Every structure is written in structure tokens, then in C-alpha cells.
Amino acid sequence: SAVQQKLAALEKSSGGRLGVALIDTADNTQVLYRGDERFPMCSTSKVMAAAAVLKQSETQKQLLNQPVEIKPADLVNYNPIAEKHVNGTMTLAELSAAALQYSDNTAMNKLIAQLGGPGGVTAFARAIGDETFRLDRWEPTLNTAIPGDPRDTTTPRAMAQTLRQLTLGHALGETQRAQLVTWLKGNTTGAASIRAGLPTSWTAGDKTGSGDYGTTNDIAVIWPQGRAPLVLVTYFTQPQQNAESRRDVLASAARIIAEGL
Ligand SMILES: [Cl-]
């Protein structure tokens, strides 16, 4: 197909390995490129952690408004929001928003702690039928992205299915689904990634990721006009440990997909 040829050429030009999964909710059809190969998730795993906390909140009503102390020991390598509140508190809702919309790594570790460790995030994934997702480590070491290492990876097919379930399906309660979608739509980190390759009139919510080996990821839910919503995930990783992340490769993959719609 034209999409596959274009994705392979993009992959060659970029020097890396690209994975793409598109789900069209009109007919549940999928377009896949390396759909069943594992890729490091990096910050895309924050969606699962936030969703798991939302799920806890369905029976623990005021959980989202619970204050959590932010301590110096909590800070890691990228803390744009958390560093502003050190020695104060943030609520779990605020931590979820920081994680999702700013990719705050301290905020992620606070969510992981709220869930009882990395295993708590993975247990939620299993509870919503994702047998592929695995979170093995905390921030920042979950970003090592070593080729062939299955730790902290998923597949494009698996993550597209899961994002669909969380944002358009019934993995969460109605109020919680709406809250996750609201957070994703307010993301600040994704302008150069999938968003840059979509028509501006199509609304999207997304979560990016980046890490070692020039790993560059984005997962999005998209509301085009003229048709049912779509889910698009784009995962990218490179052979050299010190390769720079390439948000523009994800934009190009999104353009290729949008061409084939
Ligand atoms: Cl990793």
C-alpha cells in the first residue's frame, strides 16, 4: 500500500525504527506498521498511570482532590510543574494534569507511588484487557530505551486499542473518561508531533514521549469532521544511544496517515 511504502521510506530517511497503529472507530478497522513489535513507551506510559488513578477515584470519590506533599527527594530529571511546589502540596488531579500535559517526571513518580509501584500500573493495564503493556521501572530509568529490552515497552497495536478503550470506550466511568479526554486535549508537549501533520480543524488530544536512543513517541485520539473518531499511535526509536529525538518524524508519519484517510 501507499501508506506502507511511505512509512518505510520515512523510516529509511530517518535512520530509525517506526511503529504506527491507526484505529478507525467507524468500522474498527486498523492500519498497522510494525503493529506487533515492542517499542519503549517513555512518557506515553503516563496515560496508563493517570487512567489507573482515575479508576481508583471511581470508588474513592475525593481521591483526585487529595493533597500530596512534594519533597526534595521526589524530584528527578524533568520537573517543570513539581519543582514549583516543592515543600508544598499538589492534589492527585494536579499531578495527573502535570504528568499528562507537561510530561512532568516527578508527577509520574507520585502517581506510580499512589498506585503501589510500577506493578500497580501494569495491573490496571491487565484489568482493562491490555496484556502487552508493561511498566517495570520508575522515572527516570524507564527511559533507557535499550534495543531489544522488553522493559517499559508496548506495541503500537496494543496501545492504540487501549487508548481507544480509555478515551472512546468504557474502560473508565463517564466522568473519568471525560476528565482524561479533557487533560489530553490540553496537552502542551505535542505541537511538533502528530498535531503538526493533521488538518487544524480536526481536534485531538495526545501524549508524547521521548528518551534515550532518540526515542520519540506520540499517542492521539482524533475527532475529524465527516467521520467517526480515530486513534493514532506513532512510536520511533533509533540505533544510537545519543541520537536526538525527532518530533518531525512523527509529524511526517501523521501526514502519511492523513493522506491515506
Ligand atoms: Cl526504556
XYZ file of C-alpha atoms and ligand atoms in Angstrom:
262
model
C 0.000 0.000 0.000
C 0.966 3.636 -0.464
C 0.932 4.229 3.316
C 3.275 1.298 3.964
C 5.701 2.372 1.196
C 5.758 5.938 2.524
C 6.262 4.829 6.146
C 9.127 2.554 5.081
C 10.768 5.410 3.135
C 10.338 7.752 6.123
C 11.864 5.093 8.338
C 14.856 4.755 5.962
C 15.387 8.523 5.685
C 15.239 8.913 9.495
C 17.674 6.075 10.215
C 15.339 4.597 12.852
C 12.516 2.128 13.518
C 8.959 3.430 13.261
C 5.753 1.822 14.547
C 2.273 3.101 13.687
C -1.239 1.954 14.562
C -4.427 3.648 13.329
C -7.860 2.532 14.534
C -10.960 3.824 12.735
C -13.882 3.605 15.177
C -16.429 3.731 12.319
C -15.725 0.071 11.474
C -12.976 -0.969 13.965
C -10.518 -1.407 11.077
C -6.820 -0.981 11.835
C -3.886 0.222 9.734
C -0.607 -1.121 11.162
C 3.120 -0.721 10.531
C 5.235 -2.807 12.946
C 1.971 -3.096 14.894
C 3.179 -6.059 16.970
C 6.801 -5.022 17.602
C 7.672 -3.656 21.056
C 8.820 -0.058 21.422
C 9.893 1.832 24.571
C 6.916 3.836 25.820
C 8.805 6.568 27.680
C 6.249 9.214 28.832
C 3.360 7.635 26.889
C 3.033 5.332 29.939
C 1.806 8.354 31.935
C -1.619 7.910 30.300
C -1.929 4.453 31.894
C -0.840 5.799 35.322
C -3.291 8.712 35.212
C -6.063 6.391 33.999
C -5.315 3.963 36.858
C -5.696 6.786 39.393
C -8.952 7.838 37.732
C -10.134 4.236 38.107
C -9.218 4.271 41.854
C -11.249 7.522 42.119
C -14.463 5.849 40.909
C -14.871 4.240 44.365
C -12.659 6.646 46.357
C -14.670 9.754 45.497
C -12.402 12.613 46.680
C -9.134 10.885 45.763
C -8.456 13.399 42.975
C -8.605 16.269 45.477
C -6.261 14.616 47.988
C -3.188 16.780 48.730
C 0.157 15.035 48.266
C 3.362 16.536 49.709
C 6.112 17.309 47.192
C 9.522 16.770 48.790
C 13.063 17.429 47.508
C 13.727 13.649 47.434
C 10.828 13.280 44.937
C 12.444 15.446 42.260
C 14.035 13.674 39.302
C 15.359 14.883 35.927
C 12.432 16.838 34.446
C 10.061 18.540 36.891
C 8.555 21.651 35.234
C 5.482 21.743 37.490
C 6.538 19.783 40.607
C 9.617 21.999 41.199
C 7.246 24.964 41.696
C 5.543 23.134 44.607
C 8.489 21.550 46.411
C 7.846 21.658 50.186
C 4.173 22.332 49.407
C 1.430 20.039 48.131
C -0.257 19.172 44.856
C -3.524 17.251 44.518
C -3.643 13.994 42.596
C -5.709 15.777 39.903
C -2.963 18.418 39.627
C -0.272 15.697 39.499
C -2.223 13.899 36.780
C -2.519 17.132 34.762
C 1.215 17.863 35.229
C 2.156 14.349 34.111
C -0.108 14.387 31.063
C 0.117 18.000 29.885
C 3.755 18.818 30.763
C 5.287 15.330 30.875
C 6.426 16.037 34.454
C 8.502 13.069 35.634
C 8.150 13.855 39.344
C 4.382 13.904 38.876
C 4.591 10.458 37.229
C 6.513 9.021 40.187
C 3.890 10.432 42.575
C 1.194 8.621 40.550
C 3.241 5.405 40.495
C 3.578 5.678 44.308
C -0.189 6.273 44.640
C -0.714 3.005 42.725
C 1.674 0.945 44.866
C 4.627 0.828 42.442
C 5.127 0.120 38.701
C 3.262 -3.188 39.146
C 0.149 -1.223 40.090
C 0.154 0.496 36.700
C 0.671 -2.814 34.903
C -2.127 -4.415 36.985
C -4.524 -1.698 35.774
C -3.453 -2.348 32.164
C -4.303 -6.043 32.668
C -7.611 -5.111 34.327
C -8.631 -3.234 31.163
C -7.510 -6.089 28.892
C -4.080 -4.873 27.791
C -1.838 -7.947 28.086
C 1.088 -6.290 26.267
C 1.806 -3.107 28.281
C 4.485 -3.435 30.944
C 5.858 -0.806 33.301
C 8.902 -2.195 35.079
C 10.653 0.881 36.477
C 10.185 4.367 37.906
C 11.230 7.673 36.345
C 13.761 8.448 35.011
C 15.284 4.999 34.393
C 12.200 3.787 32.489
C 13.597 5.891 29.591
C 16.756 3.834 28.865
C 15.106 2.516 25.649
C 17.738 -0.204 25.067
C 17.212 -2.074 21.756
C 15.632 -5.489 22.391
C 14.931 -4.746 26.073
C 11.264 -5.586 26.793
C 11.124 -3.461 29.992
C 8.752 -0.480 29.838
C 7.514 -1.301 26.348
C 4.280 -1.902 24.494
C 3.287 -2.425 20.855
C 1.548 0.112 18.603
C -1.495 -2.168 18.171
C -1.830 -2.697 21.930
C -1.519 0.987 22.841
C -3.967 2.123 20.131
C -6.541 -0.429 21.391
C -6.017 0.718 24.991
C -6.175 4.447 24.221
C -9.410 3.767 22.311
C -10.858 1.925 25.316
C -9.850 4.714 27.743
C -10.998 7.728 25.700
C -13.838 6.439 23.499
C -14.846 3.175 25.226
C -15.901 2.141 28.715
C -12.593 1.335 30.452
C -13.383 4.255 32.764
C -16.619 5.675 34.138
C -18.251 8.515 32.217
C -16.956 11.351 34.445
C -13.470 9.803 34.466
C -13.324 9.257 30.689
C -14.320 12.915 30.196
C -11.607 14.030 32.622
C -8.913 12.021 30.817
C -10.030 13.414 27.449
C -10.021 16.961 28.851
C -6.454 16.501 30.111
C -5.270 15.014 26.788
C -6.852 17.852 24.803
C -4.951 20.353 26.978
C -1.536 18.833 26.350
C 1.275 21.367 25.861
C 4.037 18.995 24.614
C 2.674 17.763 21.259
C 2.565 20.708 18.820
C 5.535 19.420 16.743
C 4.451 15.757 16.705
C 1.173 14.192 15.437
C -0.678 17.531 15.730
C 1.699 19.131 13.176
C 0.681 16.583 10.495
C -3.101 16.831 10.967
C -5.580 19.315 9.468
C -6.048 22.102 12.024
C -9.842 21.713 12.054
C -9.514 18.189 13.483
C -9.499 18.289 17.266
C -7.042 15.992 19.022
C -5.825 15.038 22.479
C -2.398 13.445 22.777
C 0.511 12.355 24.939
C 4.105 12.427 23.764
C 7.181 10.596 24.948
C 10.933 10.854 24.461
C 14.015 9.162 25.848
C 17.382 7.609 25.081
C 18.168 6.144 21.642
C 16.379 9.207 20.201
C 13.079 7.612 21.166
C 10.186 9.815 20.082
C 6.545 8.820 20.618
C 3.025 10.252 20.422
C -0.399 8.701 21.002
C -3.537 10.609 19.992
C -7.316 10.473 19.897
C -8.652 12.489 16.979
C -12.087 13.856 16.097
C -12.151 14.542 12.338
C -15.138 16.078 10.587
C -17.190 13.930 8.238
C -16.448 10.625 10.007
C -16.096 8.795 13.343
C -13.209 9.408 15.774
C -9.787 7.878 15.163
C -6.923 6.706 17.359
C -3.353 7.091 16.087
C -0.142 5.991 17.783
C 3.364 6.645 16.432
C 6.440 5.155 18.093
C 10.009 5.856 16.915
C 13.447 4.788 18.144
C 16.991 4.933 16.778
C 20.151 2.744 16.850
C 22.486 5.242 18.596
C 22.095 5.815 22.356
C 22.784 9.529 21.910
C 20.550 10.145 18.861
C 18.341 13.245 19.206
C 14.572 12.824 19.366
C 12.762 13.597 16.099
C 9.293 15.097 16.665
C 9.251 15.901 12.915
C 9.372 12.176 12.048
C 6.077 11.753 13.947
C 4.552 14.732 12.150
C 5.580 13.159 8.852
C 4.069 9.785 9.845
C 0.845 11.598 10.746
C 0.830 13.329 7.339
C 1.288 9.964 5.598
C -1.676 8.515 7.538
C -3.839 11.590 6.883
C -3.072 11.220 3.173
C -4.477 7.678 3.295
C -7.701 8.579 5.124
Cl 13.011 2.213 28.294
